[PDB]
Amino acid sequence: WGYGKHNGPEHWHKDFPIAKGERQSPVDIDTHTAKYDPSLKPLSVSYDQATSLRILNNGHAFNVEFDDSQDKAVLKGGPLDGTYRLIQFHFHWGSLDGQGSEHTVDKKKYAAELQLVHWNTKYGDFGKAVQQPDGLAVLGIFLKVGSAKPGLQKVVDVLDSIKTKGKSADFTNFDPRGLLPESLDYWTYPGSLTTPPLLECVTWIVLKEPISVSSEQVLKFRKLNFNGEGEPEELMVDNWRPAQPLKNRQIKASF
Numbered sequence: 001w002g003y004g005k006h007n008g009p010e011h012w013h014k015d016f017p018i019a020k021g022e023r024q025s026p027v028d029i030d031t032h033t034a035k036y037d038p039s040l041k042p043l044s045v046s047y048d049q050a051t052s053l054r055i056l057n058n059g060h061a062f063n064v065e066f067d068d069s070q071d072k073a074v075l076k077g078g079p080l081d082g083t084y085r086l087i088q089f090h091f092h093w094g095s096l097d098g099q100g101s102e103h104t105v106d107k108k109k110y111a112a113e114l115q116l117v118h119w120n121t122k123y124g125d126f127g128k129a130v131q132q133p134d135g136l137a138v139l140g141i142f143l144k145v146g147s148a149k150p151g152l153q154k155v156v157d158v159l160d161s162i163k164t165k166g167k168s169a170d171f172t173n174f175d176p177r178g179l180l181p182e183s184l185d186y187w188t189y190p191g192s193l194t195t196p197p198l199l200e201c202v203t204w205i206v207l208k209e210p211i212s213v214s215s216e217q218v219l220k221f222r223k224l225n226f227n228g229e230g231e232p233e234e235l236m237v238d239n240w241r242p243a244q245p246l247k248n249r250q251i252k253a254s255f
């Protein structure tokens, strides 16, 4: 599977039937239909003790991985119950500035989307969390092209070293707190992973406020390869999945 003409998201359902499921992501967020639920608690992002460990090009995106052996970087509160541990973050971007995000707001696509992935600790490990309806909490953050995001630059400079699929580089002491927008207002709805196995185990938390990055910054993402070293070069761009039917779901807004 991939994002090309013959192995794209429209073919996924053949190897993964859940792709036509009842709670697939991403979805379009209709700001006028989202329900303000005054019972949603604020979000608690505790990323101070975060231990980043490595950056890896997995052929579909680049993943920055964190040590999840203890409650170092967690997320709780909001619509969640229990403590969700951060395991990795990655992005989805376009070949152009008008597209790249997975979620969209009133049909507006963004230049890219940051997804911070966390698993419910009650389940012991990541492998077991994905098999539960409330196993994952994914924090989605929109990126628009404007002024540079200083905090993101350390990530941008290491990309040259993980150009092709299968490559990784040690990536310690990265502080993910520098990627958060100023506000923590969000929309939330029950959903799924956006790449195969496309499991419906995710509580999505999409932040209202996007962060800006510079054109020079996103352009660096576009120099990545889906291919492995020594294979024909295929640029890693447009690795995003299109919106899926909302169906029997309600999108709640914390504001």
Ligand SMILES: [Zn+2]
Binding pocket: 090, 091, 092, 115, 194, 195
């Ligand atoms: Zn993703």
